[PDB]
Amino acid sequence: KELGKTLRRLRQGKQVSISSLADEHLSKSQISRFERGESEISSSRLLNLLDKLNITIDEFVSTHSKTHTHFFTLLSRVRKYYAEKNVAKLLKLLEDYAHKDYESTMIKAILSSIEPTVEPSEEEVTRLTDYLFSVEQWGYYEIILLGNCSRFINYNTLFLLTKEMVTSFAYSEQNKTNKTLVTQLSINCLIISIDYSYFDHSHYLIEKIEFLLRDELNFYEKTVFLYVHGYYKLKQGQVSGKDDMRQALQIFKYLGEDALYYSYKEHYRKEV
Amino acid sequence: KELGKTLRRLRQGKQVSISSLADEHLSKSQISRFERGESEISSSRLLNLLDKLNITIDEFVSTHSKTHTHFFTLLSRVRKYYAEKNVAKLLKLLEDYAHKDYESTMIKAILSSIEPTVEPSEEEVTRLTDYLFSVEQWGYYEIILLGNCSRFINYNTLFLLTKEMVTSFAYSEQNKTNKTLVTQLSINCLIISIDYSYFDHSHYLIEKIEFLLRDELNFYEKTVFLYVHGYYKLKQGQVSGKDDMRQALQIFKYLGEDALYYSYKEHYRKEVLGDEED
Ligand SMILES: [Cl-]
Ligand SMILES: [K+]
Ligand SMILES: [K+]
Ligand SMILES: [K+]
């Protein structure tokens, strides 16, 4: 493949020689043959090279040419076509992914928001939720599928899926990307539980979100959680919840986040 | 070492059969032998398997490996010992990495903030800045080194290094970790440029930070930027910069960020309500 070309450019960018990288267990001929695309190298040997070069495996694959994952290739395209509300490109895209079950279900859920003829069937959603109940750990794939399809999942399943996601998601201490997404979807599920006064779920979600935010910055999620948690208190008769919601609005205004400000201020003039 | 055992558990959890994964690049028997820990597999073919299973390489390595990289293992230890303010543990740590030039210099810089007896020499810092200038594309390694050693880099080299980092850092559409740290380091450099009134450098860094924050969430960096940009506005005669600085303090307070609130309020009181002469 072209993995060797990527390794050579990164190695030369750091002014590191092949000889300095090679040692008693991975030779210079093996590194060079890999860099020249004439030979393959094992996964453990590639990770050892990147460790010596102080390059994350995540930096290496994102530095590599266009070999984005099958999923992020679709996600990047679907986000482009949705930003332009291009229904024609989205259906051609849905046509190109008809052989992929969960992927086409997600495209239908996204496309339904801007064109009402399209929507995922309940059999398609259940196939997705069945899959999501079965996974050992929740990765970027599972999290994005849930977030883009949550409007078509009945609440009780959405809460159980949220509980599975919070207790078994894959995050690293160096890449908190999945942890941040899990927090946002947990807050979104907390919002719905408060709307229906399912305060048994709200109290559980508040505990998990507070734990997810511990030892983290995540000021956006804390601001949203400040509003949502205050919304929870207000619906339980605690008038102090109004102050938390107004403080969150103040943060949006202070940072010039006008879209979030009006989106949450409209929710505040409602329900009050 | 037993990569296949981890891959097997993830695949079975996804209810995927080995037959569905076999193609012209890897056969069913080849996949099975790898899952049983009886053989290794090339990097390109492991990535193709993970791609069909929709598992990123980052989640797979973090799931299987119970060890971190060389530099992040060091980083975790420094951060744990620094949080404890334990000078003795940081000194033993310094000795475990004394054979690593840049790493030792970073430890000395970090340790110096709570132990003035130890300090990185100017020859140690110059070798590090030499390395940082020589890099074609800055990554997580180069960014962390510059951040933790900034207190011992003279301002003119720090701004030039900031220019290089900010111009040539690896862009990732899916992992904003490096972009966020670059933003934080650019804000830190803008602070120093405002203190010393290098207002041409300030305009440059301001324009860079504005792009980095755009289309991102990153409310923390925006809150610090609101304060620091208001600080620059005050130093240029714009009294409205005080309101921006006070609004940033209110954000820290509303979110319960007590440590950040008192650090920036102490800076506010010294620079806005401090000593006035004549
Ligand atoms: Cl911009
Ligand atoms: K390979
Ligand atoms: K099962
Ligand atoms: K103070």
Sign of the CA dihedral A42, A48, A49, A55? positive
User: Per-residue b/e over A247-268, b at no fewer than 16 CB within 10 Å?
Assistant: bbbbbbebbebeebbeebbebb
- A16 in contact with B, Cβ within 8 Å: no
User: Which residue, among A110, A216, A210, has the nearest Cα to A171 in the 3D structure?
Assistant: A216
CA–CA separation, A268 vs A261, rounded Å? 10
Structure-token pair, residue B205 = 């860094």
CA A220–ligand 4 middle distance (angstroms)? 25
Three-class SS string for chain A? CCHHHHHHHHHHHCCCCHHHHCCCCCCHHHHHHHHCCCCCCEHHHHHHHHHHHCCCHHHHHHHCCCCCCHHHHHHHHHHHHHHCCCHHHHHHHHHHCCCCHHHHHHHHHHHHCCCCCCCCCHHHHHHHHHHHHHCCCECHHHHHHHHHHHHHCCHHHHHHHHHHHHHCECCCCCCCHHHHHHHHHHHHHHHHHHHCCCHHHHHHHHHHHHHHHCCCCCHHHHHHHHHHHHHHHHHCCCCHHHHHHHHHHHHHHHCCCHHHHHHHHHHHHCCC
**Token pair for A226:** 């400040």
Q: Are the C-beta atoms of A208 and A193 separated by less than 8 Å?
A: no
- Is residue B132 a contact partner of residue B164, using CB atoms and an 8 Å limit? yes
**Which residues, including other chains, have CB under 8 Å from residue A170's CB and lie 6 or more apart?**
A137, A138, A139, A178, B59, B62, B63
A49 within 8 A of A7, measured Cβ to Cβ: yes
Q: How far is Cα of residue B144 from the mean position of the Cα atoms in its chain?
A: 5
Q: Which residue of B has its CA nearest to A135?
A: B13
Interface residue B9 vs chain A (CB under 8 A): yes
- Cβ contacts of residue A155 below 8 Å, gap of 6+? A192, A193, A196, A198
Minimal Cα–Cα distance from B118 to chain A, Å?
26
Instruction: Give the pair of three-digit tokens for residue B134.
Output: 């020589």
* Side chain identity at residue B36, one-letter code: R
Residues 6+ apart with CB under 8 A from A105: A120, A124, A125, A127, A128, A149
Whole-angstrom distance, CA of residue A121 vs CA of residue A197: 28
Spell out the SS3 assignment of chain B.
CCHHHHHHHHHHHCCCCHHHHCCCCCCHHHHHHHHCCCCCCEHHHHHHHHHHCCCCHHHHHHHHCCCCCHHHHHHHHHHHHHHCCCHHHHHHHHHHCCCCHHHHHHHHHHHHCCCCCCCCCHHHHHHHHHHHHHCCCECHHHHHHHHHCHHHCCHHHHHHHHHHHHHCECCCCCCCHHHHHHHHHHHHHHHHHHHCCCHHHHHHHHHHHHHHHCCCCCHHHHHHHHHHHHHHHHHCCCCHHHHHHHHHHHHHHHCCCHHHHHHHHHHHHHHHCCCCCC
- CA angle (B26 as vertex; B24, B32 as ends), nearest 5: 145
CA distances from B167 to A58, B140, B162, B224 (A): 20, 14, 8, 22
Q: How far is CA A101 from the centre of its chain?
A: 20
> Is the separation of the CB atoms in A246 and A264 below 8 Å?
no
Which pairs from A210-215 meet CB under 8 Å and 24+ separation? A212/A166, A212/A179, A212/A182, A212/A183, A212/A186, A213/A183
Q: List the structure tokens of A73.
A: 């290739």
> CB under 8 Å to A92, separation ≥6 — which residues?
none
**Contact at 8 Å (CB) between B220 and A219?**
yes
The rounded distance, in Å, linking the Cα atoms of A141 and A131 is 12
Residue A61: CB atoms within 10 Å: 22
- Tell me, in Å, the resolution of the deposited structure: 2.4
Q: Which of A43, A54, A62 sits opposite B71 (nearest CB)?
A: A54
> From ligand 3's centre to the CA of B15, what distance in Å?
7
Q: How far apart are CA B200 and CA B191, in angstroms?
A: 13
| Residues B67/B71/B73/B79 CA torsion (nearest 10 deg) | -150
C-beta atoms of A54 and B141 within 8 A: yes
Q: Is residue B191 a contact partner of residue B228, using CB atoms and an 8 Å limit?
A: yes
Residues within 8 A of A (CB atoms), B 168-187 only: 170, 172-178
The CA–CA distances, whole Å, from A24 to B40, B94, B100 equal 19, 27, 19
Ligand nearest to the CA of A131: 3
Identify the bridge partners of residue B138 per DSSP, sorted by sequence position: B169
Q: Are B172 and B139 in contact (CB under 8 A)?
A: no
